[PDB]
Design a protein around this ligand. Sequence first.
Ligand SMILES: Nc1ncnc2c1ncn2[C@@H]1O[C@H](COP(=O)(O)OP(=O)(O)O)[C@@H](O)[C@H]1O
Ligand SMILES: Nc1ncnc2c1ncn2[C@@H]1O[C@H](COP(=O)(O)OP(=O)(O)O)[C@@H](O)[C@H]1O
Ligand SMILES: Nc1ncnc2c1ncn2[C@@H]1O[C@H](COP(=O)(O)OP(=O)(O)O)[C@@H](O)[C@H]1O
Ligand SMILES: Nc1ncnc2c1ncn2[C@@H]1O[C@H](COP(=O)(O)OP(=O)(O)O)[C@@H](O)[C@H]1O
Ligand SMILES: [Mg+2]
Ligand SMILES: [Mg+2]
Ligand SMILES: [Mg+2]
Ligand SMILES: [Mg+2]
Lengths: 97, 442, 443, 49, 447, 433
Amino acid sequence: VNKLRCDRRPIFGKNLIDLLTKDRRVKYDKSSIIDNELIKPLQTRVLDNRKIIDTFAVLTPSAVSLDMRKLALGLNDDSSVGENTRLKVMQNCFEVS
Amino acid sequence: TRTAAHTHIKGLGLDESGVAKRVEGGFVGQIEAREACGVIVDLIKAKKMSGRAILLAGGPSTGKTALALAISQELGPKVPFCPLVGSELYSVEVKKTETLMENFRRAIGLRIKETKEVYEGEVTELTPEDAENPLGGYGKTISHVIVGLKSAKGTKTLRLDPTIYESIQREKVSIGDVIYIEANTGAVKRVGRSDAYATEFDLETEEYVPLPKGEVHKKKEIVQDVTLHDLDVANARPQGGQDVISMMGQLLKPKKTEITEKLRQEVNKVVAKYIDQGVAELIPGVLFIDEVNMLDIEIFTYLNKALESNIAPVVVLASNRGMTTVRGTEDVISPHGVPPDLIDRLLIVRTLPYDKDEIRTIIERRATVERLQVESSALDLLATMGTETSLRYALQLLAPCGILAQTSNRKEIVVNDVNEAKLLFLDAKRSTKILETSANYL
Amino acid sequence: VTRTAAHTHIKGLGLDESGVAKRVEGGFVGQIEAREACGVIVDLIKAKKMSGRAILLAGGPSTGKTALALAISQELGPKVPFCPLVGSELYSVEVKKTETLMENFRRAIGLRIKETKEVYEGEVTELTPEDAENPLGGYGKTISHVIVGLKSAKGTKTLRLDPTIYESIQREKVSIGDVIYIEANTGAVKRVGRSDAYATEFDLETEEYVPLPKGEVHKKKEIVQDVTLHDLDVANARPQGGQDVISMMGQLLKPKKTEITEKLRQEVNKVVAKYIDQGVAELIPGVLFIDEVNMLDIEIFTYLNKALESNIAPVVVLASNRGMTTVRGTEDVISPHGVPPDLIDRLLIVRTLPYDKDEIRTIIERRATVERLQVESSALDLLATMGTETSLRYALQLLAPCGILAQTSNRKEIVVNDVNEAKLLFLDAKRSTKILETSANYL
Amino acid sequence: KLFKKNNQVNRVDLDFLNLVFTLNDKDLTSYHAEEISKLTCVKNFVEEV
Amino acid sequence: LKSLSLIAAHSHITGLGLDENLQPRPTSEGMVGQLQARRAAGVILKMVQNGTIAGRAVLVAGPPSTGKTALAMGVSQSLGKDVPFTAIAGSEIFSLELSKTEALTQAFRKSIGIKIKEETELIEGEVVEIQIDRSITGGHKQGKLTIKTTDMETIYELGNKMIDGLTKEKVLAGDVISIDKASGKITKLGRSFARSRDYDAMGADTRFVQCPEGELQKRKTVVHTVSLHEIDVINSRTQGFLALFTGDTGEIRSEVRDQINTKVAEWKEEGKAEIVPGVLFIDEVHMLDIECFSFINRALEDEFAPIVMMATNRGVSKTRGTNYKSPHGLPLDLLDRSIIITTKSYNEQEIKTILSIRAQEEEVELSSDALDLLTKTGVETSLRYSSNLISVAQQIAMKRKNNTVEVEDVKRAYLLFLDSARSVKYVQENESQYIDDQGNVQISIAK
Amino acid sequence: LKSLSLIAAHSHITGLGLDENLQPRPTSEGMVGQLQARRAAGVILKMVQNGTIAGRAVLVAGPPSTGKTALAMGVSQSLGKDVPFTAIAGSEIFSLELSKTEALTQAFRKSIGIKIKEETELIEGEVVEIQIDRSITGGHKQGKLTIKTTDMETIYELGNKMIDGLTKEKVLAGDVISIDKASGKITKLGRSFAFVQCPEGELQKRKTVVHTVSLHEIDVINSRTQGFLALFTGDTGEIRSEVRDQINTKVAEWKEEGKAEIVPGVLFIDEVHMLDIECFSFINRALEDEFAPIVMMATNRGVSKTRGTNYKSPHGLPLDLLDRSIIITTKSYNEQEIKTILSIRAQEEEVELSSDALDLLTKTGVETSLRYSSNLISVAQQIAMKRKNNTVEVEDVKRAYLLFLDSARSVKYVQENESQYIDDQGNVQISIA
Ligand SMILES: Nc1ncnc2c1ncn2[C@@H]1O[C@H](COP(=O)(O)OP(=O)(O)O)[C@@H](O)[C@H]1O
Ligand SMILES: Nc1ncnc2c1ncn2[C@@H]1O[C@H](COP(=O)(O)OP(=O)(O)O)[C@@H](O)[C@H]1O
Ligand SMILES: Nc1ncnc2c1ncn2[C@@H]1O[C@H](COP(=O)(O)OP(=O)(O)O)[C@@H](O)[C@H]1O
Ligand SMILES: Nc1ncnc2c1ncn2[C@@H]1O[C@H](COP(=O)(O)OP(=O)(O)O)[C@@H](O)[C@H]1O
Ligand SMILES: [Mg+2]
Ligand SMILES: [Mg+2]
Ligand SMILES: [Mg+2]
Ligand SMILES: [Mg+2]
């Protein structure tokens, strides 16, 4: 236990997490502007272009391989990844919208 | 307090729409040149003409970049200024055309001014104003909400329509905590608890903001400036925190693609929508491209195409070339390496070298900027050697001269000190001569 | 059965203790000077004191540059690290060649590391967290630390297990009564399978029914494994992997190779110095061998001009087979072996020599012994001759067809007729160009 | 299965040997590491010894 | 001492051989001669230490093996640590993934460095006990926890928000934890030593550190030596440190460079961050492309322009990227805004002193007449050749096992290993033996 | 309208300015002279407005300063709305990350446009009262709305989507809102007295909706899922020919169906005198395509070495293009015509010119070039305002002329200023002695 403590304890990061979180942080306050409505983000653009995306989407991939989507990420009944890794990714994908 | 062969220029050194002073703003000579420069600056300040180009030509040591920095200084920080070089146009990540387009859109800038009344301070009291609903109902009916707000040297009680309850639910503030209110749009914002409450708990993570300065109600101005290129990038780049596209932005290599022209026309349309309303205002910028000789014929053709645009600001070109072969076609030899098609579409200014008195003034002004002083003898000999060797060789010897004077503990320079300074370092001509006189591959 | 590809006939330089190379030894006949110089280079590398030196081997083809390089690699031993390299291998597509050649330079040197770990085994009966009878006012007593009595037949102990090791336990979906294997430090969980007690419960089961391995619960083992420097380089630059979803995503992020910054290398160097002060690790030098150097770009030459200046540069041995040749990537830069003089200023030139008829006879008979093929004296003389006038390589290539022609004639020895028929059915470069001179349409 | 032969006998974890510091900055402040390194408390096991 | 002790090309030079008056001793510090070059290098080093002006370039002129790289690295060593010194090559800048202008931008950025200081106020103390009335009253009853240190101990109230905070990072007391005074964030460091015997095997999380000594909360300032380029990288990407280590900078746009410069100026005027003068050195710059030359000419006039060091042995020759020639193989535009230092070949006295110091660095004992003949070889050959000769002679001597390197030892070492002149003569006299440039070589031996 | 148009060399021209019989006026709608060029432009205009024929490309050539892009801008603005016009630089197509050929295909496809029509219904009126019935926990909110206009005043139940939309935005019962039932959008026009909106007429109306869409966006959005973001960002390319011809068949059967009508636009390509033979061969093929919009191609170089071939191809173009392409050539301008163009520019940019000053400006423009006169007429404004009068005198323009040099005189100057500047080798005399 003494040697375990002597070896495990000296674990030091490269620079920090405080350094990155303080350089990322900006001293500027909120200072809200109309830029929020001006930008109209990409997700909102997809949302508001519903009419055109539903009126101009006709084709289909006439051939597709079933269950190849599962093996694309490697999740299936038999794989080298963890047993409940596939369960967790399936669940969070269920919540991810 | 640091500089790099510059910062001695103080604008253009002009007068009130007259003739520039002979030695003004760290300038000597080229009175006609910098008067034309001031004319150019006035044209930029006019903000009317679109897609106008100009090139200044001369030899080495002519101070073209110093003049360009003079335009940049005279413009002021409010006016955007985007320096550029023909070397960075050749980009591995994306084509030279798109890099040119982005540097083009960087020069132009958009300014927006915003107005909003602010109610802020410590919430002294919260109470609804119950009333009688027009339709008979056993339930309660509140018609107003009275909030008591306390700021520095002033307190205020304001009635609020009971629609403010939804905002107060979105904020979760009850009492003893400073809030943020605006007049017309309503809503609430929470900044933090009152600073006097910190002593209540020995240990807590909440920083307690002080009582806001000034009265409870305020009306401040918001000024913001953004280049159209930044708005293009913001409208183009995705943003998110949870959606799949959010970390598709991550776990990859974010590369700048060629922005579609429909995005540019749409953002121009919204800029028009916000400038006619008066919220936005457009001020043209300038793109400073020096050593344009290094650019290829493709860049010249695209500049010819793009100079006619109506969001095209003034562009200034700098090059020391003359009758030289154009990059891309060895047969085509054009003045300053630029094909004559652009030259006809732009204006041209000739630059001349500096005289012995002007070099003396340059040396003395540089010494004063360096905060190191030169006596008459060393100044004269340094001027003579600068006239015979080159401008830069005399210009850059001040630091070794100063450090050598410091080694001998003398504040100023003397004849043997500057003689040693010449001895240690050799200029281009001496280097070439020792090159031909050396057979050891040196 | 026995496979031979132009090699395995040499077992190193095999020089004497005085350094003198005998006439015939270890697949080497004659060639005293180059073998002695190579032994001197071995004495250089075994000194374990000097770095940054380099040498280039020069001469015409078929003289045994590859043979000498393989000999020095063999005598150095598998413990001593070696990095073969070809000139065409340097030219990559993902990152610039400088990163690749620094990668090879780091790959040259190695370092063995002493380490000790703890071993545990036994079958599983308990899946319970800490009961924590005292609530203390902060705990609704329960923890993601499942206490398991490690039921080995020879010992049992209840362990407070990390959420990660218990998560790996859940990955194996263990039940009551099955052997488990865990680690004190890493917590790695592997199960040999269900115990043979539960074998009779199911008439069939995918899970394998296994007996309990013999041994104590807590066992301690030490390793002195040798790992090269650049495996640690890539592991530090990019984490290798893990069973958890977070590690799965992390290794899914960036699996491609890019440049390597020096700060991590220097930190690793400092911690290795700390280890050698502790005695945990001991460094070993490295050798880098480059093939067909005449084609290298002038930029590579310029960078290698300063690569040897670095204190981490190991000995790099070089081979070239050119005379007055212009350096590739240049126009008028012409020099011996196509290498700029600035590089060769610090290098040492060693030259190989041709051979006499007896040497060809000796190498031919050594080869014939290598492929356990017996030949007659007259056929041996013919092979030695035609090798002298045509090439050694042609004779070596057609050695096997001679034996095949003997075998299809139900003969175990090569005769004059065998080599004559082989020459009938195969032609060397000389008669190839003779035939192609008189070509109707480039015959 | 032909590749999952016993490697623990000849594999180095290299994670317990604090040489994976590129992942350490995710959840570590510099001053915390500085203060936890200087609290390498020897002689506490030695006094029990 | 922290770096590798393996003998590099120049493991005998450590710093600068000048005095306070910048006068070089003939044999000092490990480098001999180049008195004018040493004085000029010391002038440049003193000006770098001054750091009051920038945007200047310096070049050294001399034949190969004259000491250009030696002088550059000696100047770097005399500069010392914590002063950002960047050494790059003119060949590696040609990046197939990064634009050469962008690569030069990072090369300039890494040369200059900035020191940033930060003050911290944290509460450090070992917890004694925690008592929360979570059942008698529930709902964050504002329980009391006692915190001890080796010199003092107090009991701290816990608020409702503090109850929720301590609900995470659960601590059962008997454990050393620290909480930031400002942000109230609690960090669990490790238990006390009394917890070492709870179980035989524990995971990587449990640690047993000593109780913090002194008062409860303390003030400490932390200074960081962080250059500009890494800040650019970390601001460019959500996680820029991985791009820093791997090098996948992604061609950082110049739009954030103005913002980072403004932030640097704000920190400088606030006093939060200070800059440190930097030195950039490039070896064998004679090979270089004209786009790089133009970008260097442009960037030399910027305020953030560290001193740039060049080394070149080329005479008047062609520049890469253009058909025509130029002095030193370099455009006259660069020579205009530069100062050139001339270096010369060493004489027999300097050569023998260099051989002696190199042998001392190699720990190779020599003889007087052996030294004389080695110096004769070094003057007939190049200087770098005799060093290798004596290097090999050391192992040949230990083969002979007779201590010092012998005269016949060096003679046999020279006999076994060909010099450049002998190699060229052998190639010329046996051009048929070697594969000629045209692709013709005589394979047959018998005529 | 309401679009930014700054002072530019192509802003003054507004339309072709030619009669119904296509004989242009000498000075009309921004152009002076080039009567044959303007009537040829009208010929191309009637070609494109007919739209029956496809696969037509033209050559406009000649020396510089011939108003080639001036005529191009004139015909483009004559096209105006209801027709897409694409202008592309020749050097723009050269991309290292984007395949040239398929980028050219999508360039053609951008010119072709499809207009789809559909009729939608909507309700407009003044809101009367806001009333909802909801629960704090169970939800199941039941909103009701009273709407009114000048003639109809009625109450309607507000569904879940409408009540959610009304809650998501701050609404006032005095506001005037418009709702489309099929799409559910809320169009808050204005407000009643606290306030501009004043609704009238029928409460519910049905109106048509038309989308001006080009075939290129159909192709890119149907190529893959990320086609939307690729369109909005530009990181697309290498679209498979399968979706290409599938969408071609789909639009063909929709056109024969009569559901939507195609509008074959006009493509403009510039300075193709510098280009690749790959481009030339591919456009030779693509001109024969059935879905080929009219292509405007401009050039300025005469006989020169076409890039990609050693030989000096005549006119800077290969003969295969000249076989299938019709040529339009423009002549120079007389001194009177140049004066008229300068007067048109001055009227466009509103600067008073003295008669003698304008005449000498015209004569020096004829002497040097008309671009020089174009920039001199701009700098004359600032020269004249620095002396505080909008009128430009002879001394203003003479000062401008002596201030700024022309290309020819600067060339001659550097002929006498050779030594002061480096040569092609790089030899200069920075010194004076
Ligand atoms: N009017 C002036 N007065 C003083 N110094 C000047 C003046 N004009 C130029 N300079 C000098 O010229 C230098 C800039 O030259 P630069 O434009 O880079 O060279 P070039 O014009 O040959 O390209 C500055 O360092 C400045 O000291
Ligand atoms: N002196 C030698 N003794 C024994 N075998 C030799 C000798 N020289 C060459 N060889 C043979 O040459 C073969 C390798 O040739 P290689 O060295 O690749 O040709 P090159 O000289 O072009 O590099 C080996 O199989 C080896 O048996
Ligand atoms: N001041 C010095 N003292 C001792 N040896 C030196 C000195 N300068 C150069 N050398 C010798 O020069 C060799 C390196 O030459 P280098 O300076 O790299 O050539 P270049 O000038 O082309 O960079 C080394 O072997 C070293 O022994
Ligand atoms: N008939 C005209 N009416 C108005 N402007 C014209 C006329 N002819 C030429 N111009 C002017 O001449 C310029 C021609 O430039 P452009 O067509 O781009 O190339 P080029 O100079 O080779 O003709 C236009 O900017 C335009 O203002
Ligand atoms: Mg300049
Ligand atoms: Mg070979
Ligand atoms: Mg060197
Ligand atoms: Mg035109």
